[PDB]
Design a protein around this ligand. Structure first.
Ligand code: NAD
Length: 238
């Protein structure tokens, strides 16, 4: 897949799926910018911008600065996110608040600062990383799952608001990804009503990034408001 000369922004580019996706876009020929709280590696094969996606003021300021000098923003990938686990009645006030500020507020702030640009240029692609936990309830992850369901609903409504402008807006919802507990995930936990993984393996970040590239590409030129679950079948299609 080819992205030569296209401007691509990826949040959460510091590691995990965000890094793998920013890298895949580089290897597809794009001009990439990764945004993240921290870039603790010694080097990155793309340009980097310190950014707390939950700080609405910092997002405004960075997006304004960068949009001053780019003609066109071909692809925005929302991949920043955190996981805070706990039973619903034991989750701390702080874990609830930052779960939502980061996992939903982050994309909301990016949308508030970039939608005008997508409207102006009359096209582009957005891809937002949700989670399998937005598709199915997960013991221990009520807050995380709900924050990713909010994210999914947000990105689909944004996609409907920008469809008039020719923008495609989609999601990828990863299951367990590598970022003997692995063989027990694959088998499943019947006791917590969490199915194993029929494909008999967990995901590699590249397999999430590859799906994001497809959805951001012109091969997906008629695909909008879709959410591809990448999880070896663990949710059984739900
Ligand atoms: N790993 C899995 O199995 C899995 C499953 C479902 C969903 N996901 C989702 O995939 C995406 C990437 O997750 P990962 O597994 O690569 O996680 P990770 O923790 O390895 O990396 C996520 C990155 O997000 C960045 N980030 C966190 N808070 C931020 C903030 N406020 N502002 C800017 N950047 C911030 C972190 O600094 C980190 O670099 C996330 O959206 C995550 O929720 C992952």
């Amino acid at each position: 897949l080819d992205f030569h000369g296209q401007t691509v922004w990826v949040t959460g580019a510091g590691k995990g799926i965000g890094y793998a996706t920013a890298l895949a876009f580089v290897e597809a020929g794009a001009n990439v910018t990764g945004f993240d709280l921290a870039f603790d590696g010694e080097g990155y094969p793309f340009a980097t911008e310190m950014l707390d996606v939950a700080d609405a003021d910092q997002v405004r300021d960075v997006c304004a600065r960068l949009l001053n000098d780019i003609e066109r923003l071909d692809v925005l990938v929302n991949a920043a996110g955190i996981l805070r686990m706990g039973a619903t009645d034991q989750l701390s006030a702080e874990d609830w608040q930052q779960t939502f500020a980061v996992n939903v507020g982050g994309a909301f702030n990016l949308f508030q600062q970039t939608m005008a640009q997508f409207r102006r240029q009359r096209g582009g692609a957005i891809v937002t990383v949700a989670s399998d936990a937005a598709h199915t309830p997960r013991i221990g992850m009520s807050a995380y799952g709900a924050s990713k369901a909010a994210l999914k609903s947000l990105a689909l409504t944004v996609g409907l608001e920008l469809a008039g402008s020719g923008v495609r807006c989609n999601l990828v919802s990863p299951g367990s990804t590598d970022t003997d507990a692995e063989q027990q995930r694959i088998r499943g936990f019947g006791e917590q009503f969490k199915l194993g993984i029929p494909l008999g393996k967990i995901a590699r970040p590249q397999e999430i990034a590859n799906t994001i590239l497809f959805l951001a590409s012109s091969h997906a030129s008629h695909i909008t408001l879709q959410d591809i679950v990448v999880d070896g079948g663990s949710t059984l299609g739900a």
